[PDB]
Scaffold this active site. Structure first.
Site, PDB file in Angstrom:
ATOM      1  N   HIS A 113     -11.984  13.554  13.243  1.00 15.08           N
ATOM      2  CA  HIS A 113     -12.988  14.558  13.635  1.00 15.08           C
ATOM      3  C   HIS A 113     -12.950  15.843  12.785  1.00 15.08           C
ATOM      4  CE1 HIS A 113     -15.704  16.421  16.760  1.00 15.08           C
ATOM      5  NE2 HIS A 113     -15.153  17.517  16.264  1.00 15.08           N
ATOM      6  N   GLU A 114     -11.780  16.474  12.662  1.00 11.66           N
ATOM      7  CA  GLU A 114     -11.674  17.759  11.948  1.00 11.66           C
ATOM      8  C   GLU A 114     -12.007  17.564  10.479  1.00 11.66           C
ATOM      9  OE1 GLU A 114     -11.554  19.289  15.353  1.00 11.66           O
ATOM     10  OE2 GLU A 114     -11.824  20.421  13.503  1.00 11.66           O
ATOM     11  N   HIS A 117     -15.615  17.601   9.814  1.00 17.56           N
ATOM     12  CA  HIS A 117     -16.072  18.965   9.596  1.00 17.56           C
ATOM     13  C   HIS A 117     -15.698  19.468   8.186  1.00 17.56           C
ATOM     14  CE1 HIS A 117     -17.530  19.581  13.658  1.00 17.56           C
ATOM     15  NE2 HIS A 117     -16.326  19.547  14.198  1.00 17.56           N
TER      16      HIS A 117
END
Ligand SMILES: COc1ccc(S(N)(=O)=O)cc1
Ligand SMILES: [Ca+2]
Ligand SMILES: [Ca+2]
Ligand SMILES: [Ca+2]
Ligand SMILES: [Zn+2]
Ligand SMILES: [Zn+2]
Length: 158
Positions: A113-114, A117
């Site tokens: 997820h990170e 980003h």
């Protein structure tokens, strides 16, 4: 928004959560990058010194940016979209309990997820997507990106 305009990307692990074995931190982060390089032209390498594109940091509360952490639960992590300096950096809340498994908060899954980003992806409204804002454990050994994650990342790269 911003994307990396080069194919060789570096990451550096600034410091290590005491919640995990060092080798497990290393492997969880490596595996998370691999999820994204599997579906883009990107190549990621860990460097031990100097300036990386993506700095991986564990920290709690106020930690020098404008995104104060909030203790255990709530925000688990946050990262900066591509760019110079802090751009690309991924910060993991030390007030979570990081793990290799379904206990605590799974570091690999959060890192997928990170890193999404860090590469330029925003949140998905699709609950099946890794970029959906809510953390939900799924089996890490058979983990796969949703179709939604793939079209998103492939809209930016490759
Ligand atoms: C799957 O990975 C994650 C990581 C973080 C978050 S959040 N937005 O801090 O709750 C959600 C999902
Ligand atoms: Ca938190
Ligand atoms: Ca950076
Ligand atoms: Ca911790
Ligand atoms: Zn931060
Ligand atoms: Zn997010």
């Amino acid at each position: 928004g911003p994307v990396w305009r080069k194919h060789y990307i570096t990451y550096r692990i600034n410091n290590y959560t005491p919640d995990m074995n060092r080798e497990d931190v290393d492997y969880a982060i490596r595996k998370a990058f691999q999820v994204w390089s599997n579906v883009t032209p990107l190549k990621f390498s860990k460097i031990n010194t100097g300036m990386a594109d993506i700095l991986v940091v564990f920290a709690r509360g106020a930690h020098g940016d404008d995104h104060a952490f909030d203790g255990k639960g709530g925000i688990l992590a946050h990262a900066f979209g591509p760019g110079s300096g802090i751009g690309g950096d991924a910060h993991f809340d030390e007030d979570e309990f990081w793990t290799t498994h379904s206990g605590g908060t799974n570091l690999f899954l959060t890192a997928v997820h990170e890193i999404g980003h860090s590469l330029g992806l925003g949140h998905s409204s699709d609950p099946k997507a890794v970029m959906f804002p809510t953390y939900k454990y799924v089996d890490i050994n058979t983990f796969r990106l949703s179709a939604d994650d793939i079209r998103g990342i492939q809209s930016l790269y490759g």
